[PDB]
Symmetry: C3
Subunit: 176 residues, 3 copies
Amino acid sequence: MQAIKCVVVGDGAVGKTCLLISYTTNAFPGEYIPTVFDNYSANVGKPVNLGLWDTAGQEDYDRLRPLSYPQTDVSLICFSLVSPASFENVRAKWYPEVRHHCPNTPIILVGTKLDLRDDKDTIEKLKEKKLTPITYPQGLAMAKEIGAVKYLECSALTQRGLKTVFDEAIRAVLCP
Amino acid sequence: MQAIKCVVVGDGAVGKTCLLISYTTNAFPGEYIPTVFDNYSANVMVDGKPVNLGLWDTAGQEDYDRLRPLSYPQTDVSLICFSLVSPASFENVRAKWYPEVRHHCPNTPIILVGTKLDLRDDKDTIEKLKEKKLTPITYPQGLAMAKEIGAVKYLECSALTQRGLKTVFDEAIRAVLCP
Amino acid sequence: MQAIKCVVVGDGAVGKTCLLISYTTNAFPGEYIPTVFDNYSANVMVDGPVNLGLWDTAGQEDYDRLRPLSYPQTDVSLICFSLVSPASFENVRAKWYPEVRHHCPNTPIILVGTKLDLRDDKDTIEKLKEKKLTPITYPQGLAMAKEIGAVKYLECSALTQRGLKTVFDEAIRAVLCP
Ligand SMILES: Nc1nc2c(ncn2[C@@H]2O[C@H](COP(=O)(O)OP(=O)(O)O)[C@@H](O)[C@H]2O)c(=O)[nH]1
Ligand SMILES: Nc1nc2c(ncn2[C@@H]2O[C@H](COP(=O)(O)OP(=O)(O)O)[C@@H](O)[C@H]2O)c(=O)[nH]1
Ligand SMILES: Nc1nc2c(ncn2[C@@H]2O[C@H](COP(=O)(O)OP(=O)(O)O)[C@@H](O)[C@H]2O)c(=O)[nH]1
Ligand SMILES: [Zn+2]
Ligand SMILES: [Zn+2]
Ligand SMILES: [Zn+2]
Ligand SMILES: [Zn+2]
Ligand SMILES: [Zn+2]
Ligand SMILES: [Zn+2]
Ligand SMILES: [Zn+2]
Ligand SMILES: [Zn+2]
């Protein structure tokens, strides 16, 4: 059994909690959603226990220090594919955070809310603000920029790509 | 979108946790009840614009709670809860909970919430209270206590049957958005 | 109504969280299990009213910022070990009994053997034999309970719901009827 600690980081409202709830319980939350999902684990794969940690705000101001204690093995940096602000924060904030608190450990870059990237209403609302969803090549390029071992897109709502995210988190630690 | 932090305070066993679980999940708990419901939030639309309503349950007195839920981060509105069928919980609104909110959340609105409305005018809860020379708290008494502590509203509800529950949280938002 | 604080302690992976989930919800968890079930209580009638508060734990008390064994005061503790992990059984004497004695002196202990469903699962017994191990027997468990001064020894399975209700019934009785 190899234990692994996987922490999910990123801006508020990108879908970190929903990612974890959908994957761990196969249910998508209702309108009231936990702010921070509790720590869960599974024994999966080869012999592996995958420990999953949700986060609140920036590590430095979180009394629980989920990114630092105990030691993190792999980080999922999440941004919403329909929030360009949240993508820019990968570079401004989240890659710096993981490098600072978890130096020399693998990062997976995860674009969330894949289902909304072709949602008519979502695209229109963005267009009204002179914005457009983040594309696959853009995400891939950000992943290369920050030294992420994988770029993955998913929807917690439809579960498209969701299983691959957590399989790759494990592979990043087991098969570096 | 304005974020609103709403904290639920009051004596043990008044129904704070059940108030939150019933509202957020539309189910009333079974035999085993969490002591303190985790933090949940919702994106709500109120007369035009998006609000995120964050709900916090509490354990005991703030000063001895290492989590300090009433203080961190800053609370926008407090629900002081007492059970309509526990006069002692009601007296503690004046002895404990109003002083607590005034101390830790100065100059923020209070809603006074009478819980367990489904028991107030009965099951023969009335007869069991009478054995002890006690009587359920009446609406006028609750209203008077709300005035005394400067609460912006007094509301009665049942988590069990959901009587009046949605109004509690609608009014909590309105107290912050419409001071 | 008497409030009772019951804390569940023992090695990682013995089945503490599952014990608590299965009992309180009558169903065994999926592949994804909370590391530490949140604090729950129930109002229960035993003989002539009790509130039984249940606390799950993580690692050793002294390094757990939450200090569940110490704060507030514990009335009874369940020391758990897996019937198919001899190492976890040895840690009853090396670790868990000393922990409860240090942080909760002069309070009752119930010793609980978990994963009773495996004590005869061939995949498990054979794999144990390969490592020169054998599942813990009832007499061994009983002897350890005597050694550590536990007021009861109980065996259970969260997976099948064998013996679960008895664990919590006896937890109550240990405080109510000392
Ligand atoms: N359409 C869609 N909405 C999502 C998805 N994941 C999260 N959301 C919504 O995005 C908002 C924030 O989700 P949450 O998981 O609480 O984000 P967090 O702050 O990063 O934890 C909520 O309104 C969710 O319902 C998704 O995959 N698809
Ligand atoms: N009849 C009735 N009982 C309730 C109601 N809400 C809570 N309770 C019960 O009151 C007890 C305490 O509830 P809880 O929510 O845990 O109280 P807290 O300590 O204030 O969180 C439990 O036995 C609940 O079942 C209600 O609306 N009606
Ligand atoms: N076969 C069997 N497995 C169990 C039982 N209880 C827990 N487990 C498994 O043992 C592992 C650890 O359980 P958990 O409750 O998380 O252990 P804890 O670390 O002590 O809380 C998980 O793989 C569970 O599915 C049981 O009664 N029987
Ligand atoms: Zn969240
Ligand atoms: Zn930092
Ligand atoms: Zn438009
Ligand atoms: Zn509660
Ligand atoms: Zn929790
Ligand atoms: Zn105070
Ligand atoms: Zn556990
Ligand atoms: Zn210790």
